From a paper:
ICOS (CD278) is a type I transmembrane glycoprotein that belongs to the CD28 family of co-stimulatory immunoreceptors. On the other hand, ICOS-L (CD275) belongs to the B7 family and is expressed on the surface of APCs5,7,8 and non-hematopoietic cells under inflammatory conditions.
We determined the molecular basis for the co-stimulatory signal provided by ICOS by solving the three-dimensional structure formed by the extracellular domains of ICOS (residues 21–129) and its ligand ICOS-L (residues 19–248) at 3.3 Å resolution by x-ray crystallography. ICOS-L is organized in two distinct domains: the most apical domain (D1) adopts a V-type fold, whereas the membrane-proximal domain (D2) adopts a C1-type fold. ICOS/ICOS-L interact in a 1:1 receptor-ligand stoichiometry. The main binding interface is formed by the FDPPPFK motif (amino acids 114–120) located in the ICOS FG loop, which interacts with residues from strands C and C’ and loops CC’ and C’D of ICOS-L. These residues form a network of interactions that include H-bonds and aromatic stacking (top). Clear electron density was observed in the co-complex crystal structure for two N-acetyl glucosamine (GlcNAc) and three mannose residues of the N-linked glycan at position N110. Unexpectedly, ICOS-L residues F122, Q123, and E124 form H-bonds with this ICOS glycan, which buries ~300 Å2 of surface area on ICOS-L (bottom). In the CTLA-4/B7 and PD1/PD-L1 complexes, the receptors cross the IgV domains of their cognate ligands at ~110° and 90°, respectively. However, in the ICOS/ICOS-L complex, the IgV domains cross at 150°. A unique feature of ICOS, however, is its unusually long strand C’ that protrudes from the surface of the ectodomain leading to the formation of a ligand interaction not yet observed in any of the previously solved CD28/B7 family complexes.
Author numbering:
A (entry chain C): 19 to 149, 153 to 230
B (entry chain N): 1 to 118
C (entry chain A): 30 to 128
Write the structure that this text describes.
Amino acid sequence: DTQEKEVRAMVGSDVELSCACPEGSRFDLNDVYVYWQTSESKTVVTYHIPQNSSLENVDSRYRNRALMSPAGMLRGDFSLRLFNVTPQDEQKFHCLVLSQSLGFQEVLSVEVTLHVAANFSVPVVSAPHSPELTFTCTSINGYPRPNVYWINKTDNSLLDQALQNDTVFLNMRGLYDVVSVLRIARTPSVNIGCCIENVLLQQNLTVGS
Amino acid sequence: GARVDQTPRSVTKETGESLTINCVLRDPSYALGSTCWYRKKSGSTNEESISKGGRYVETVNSGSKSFSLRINDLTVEDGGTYRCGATDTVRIYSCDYLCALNGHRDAACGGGTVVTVN
Amino acid sequence: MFIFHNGGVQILCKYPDIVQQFKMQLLKGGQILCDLTKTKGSGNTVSIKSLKFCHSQLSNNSVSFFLYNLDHSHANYYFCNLSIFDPPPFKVTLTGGYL
Ligand SMILES: *[C@@H]1O[C@H](CO)[C@@H](O[C@@H]2O[C@H](CO)[C@@H](O[C@@H]3O[C@H](CO[C@H]4O[C@H](CO)[C@@H](O)[C@H](O)[C@@H]4O)[C@@H](O)[C@H](O[C@H]4O[C@H](CO)[C@@H](O)[C@H](O)[C@@H]4O)[C@@H]3O)[C@H](O)[C@H]2NC(C)=O)[C@H](O)[C@H]1NC(C)=O
Ligand SMILES: *[C@@H]1O[C@H](CO)[C@@H](O[C@@H]2O[C@H](CO)[C@@H](O[C@@H]3O[C@H](CO[C@H]4O[C@H](CO)[C@@H](O)[C@H](O)[C@@H]4O)[C@@H](O)[C@H](O[C@H]4O[C@H](CO)[C@@H](O)[C@H](O)[C@@H]4O)[C@@H]3O)[C@H](O)[C@H]2NC(C)=O)[C@H](O)[C@H]1NC(C)=O
Ligand SMILES: *[C@@H]1O[C@H](CO)[C@@H](O)[C@H](O)[C@H]1NC(C)=O
Ligand SMILES: *[C@@H]1O[C@H](CO)[C@@H](O)[C@H](O)[C@H]1NC(C)=O
Ligand SMILES: *[C@@H]1O[C@H](CO)[C@@H](O)[C@H](O)[C@H]1NC(C)=O
Ligand SMILES: *[C@@H]1O[C@H](CO)[C@@H](O)[C@H](O)[C@H]1NC(C)=O
Ligand SMILES: *[C@@H]1O[C@H](CO)[C@@H](O)[C@H](O)[C@H]1NC(C)=O
Ligand SMILES: *[C@@H]1O[C@H](CO)[C@@H](O)[C@H](O)[C@H]1NC(C)=O
């Protein structure tokens, strides 16, 4: 009885994924086993075992960021509270609820896809030249992969993508950096600029030469 | 999401003879961005980056979208466990932080290979 | 993964010694031949419930069942449903054999 849910969130922002039983009625914490884990990676986000309170098998990533509220558990609301979301937290999170009284049959299973996003730095341009000239546009720390576009600022038209070499880097924080070089022919009065696009965020950053 | 599987899971080899460890970046990953190879020594339970080239020879097929490492002239203490880290058509600054990214849609280290040389 | 003695067959199914609460089911022909379920209780007690008991001897790294019914005719694959409840993550693994 999986309920496909979608939760979009931002990095460093505390988000709440929900695993809700329709009944406002109560549950038995000494009977039920609760598991929050990723669908593919199967990494332990958090869990509830009847007779112990010390999550030692919680994964290093989620060691202290995944919290289930117990009073809400008894009320039937197994909702996870995720803190300080990181780019590696975009996963299909699976909440699974087994009742020992029914021979470990599943009473609740909900798959909550989590999308996360981040904002790139404002692009930085320069004008170094060679034989024709070259431009360098650098923007960093955004999620997911950025779309970079170059604009003929004089008339606000879009230059062809074959004029640019892009190399996106993985920041050690999971965020992305990008360096884009554009080689065009020499001309006076060539107002152009750079553009960083986060399609998930719907936000475009432009900077003139 | 995207991850990387590596073979073999466990191998025992003879001293001096080369050993090969493969790795593939499973679909629907587009292409290999950069490859890293890590090994950890028996006791300290911490990994270290294997410097490519020389004794450790790497072969990469972008068409096959898979990479392989070869060890020559195996000292008896070349044993341990070996991971390989790949990335989905993007590049990384340092290998030091590749395995530190789990479930990232653009980075995954291998399952590991256990090696004992006699 | 199993042996034949005493006009019967001992089918042993292994599991990681880490798991401390689990449910081991033996399946052949799609049918549940044997069953065992281990649980850790309060006050450091262990509960074992078995809806179909096959003289299961519970080694700490594997569970073995004994079928004194041979069923040598129509020899099928033998699967071992393994559900891991403790410790997380919860996973179900099927390992199979022949004869
Ligand atoms: C190895 O052992 C594990 C032990 O857990 C098995 O996994 C179990 O498999 C059974 C059967 O597939 C699962 O039981 C099913 O649970 C479903 C949950 O959905 C509802 O369940 C409750 C009860 O009413 C509702 O309150 C709740 O809101 C959910 O909406 C049920 O829907 C299933 O019933 C339906 O299917 C059965 C067939 O099984 C039909 O006969 C019924 O008429 C009905 O249509 C069923 O109860 C159980 O949840 C699983 N447990 C776990 C932990 O995953 C493995 O299956 C076994 N090995 C293999 C190979 O299967
Ligand atoms: C972004 O896009 C804009 C257009 O939207 C481009 O700007 C135009 O670029 C063209 C081509 O480089 C320019 O055409 C050239 O104009 C020069 C003089 O400009 C003035 O000329 C007329 C009067 O003669 C004025 O009305 C006009 O407003 C301009 O102020 C000429 O000297 C050039 O001559 C060269 O070409 C001709 C024909 O090819 C040859 O006969 C000559 O020998 C010489 O080789 C040429 O005609 C146009 O003027 C530009 N206009 C503006 C407003 O910029 C940008 O170049 C483009 N930028 C990028 C980065 O893509
Ligand atoms: C969240 O974690 C990051 C590093 O993971 C840290 O820089 C930051 O201070 C933490 N807290 C907040 C509120 O961002
Ligand atoms: C409680 O008991 C054991 C030993 O501490 C451990 O394996 C188990 O995961 C613990 N769980 C919780 C939720 O404290
Ligand atoms: C530009 O990028 C391409 C790949 O798109 C690469 O082959 C090439 O080495 C880069 N540099 C130049 C100068 O083309
Ligand atoms: C961002 O810029 C690109 C390139 O011009 C454009 O195709 C896209 O629609 C823009 N989106 C927004 C929200 O500005
Ligand atoms: C991120 O980029 C936006 C829009 O592209 C811009 O206004 C600002 O620099 C940042 N702030 C947001 C999240 O509003
Ligand atoms: C439990 O099994 C392990 C192997 O996983 C073994 O080393 C140990 O002796 C066993 N302990 C018992 C049976 O108490």
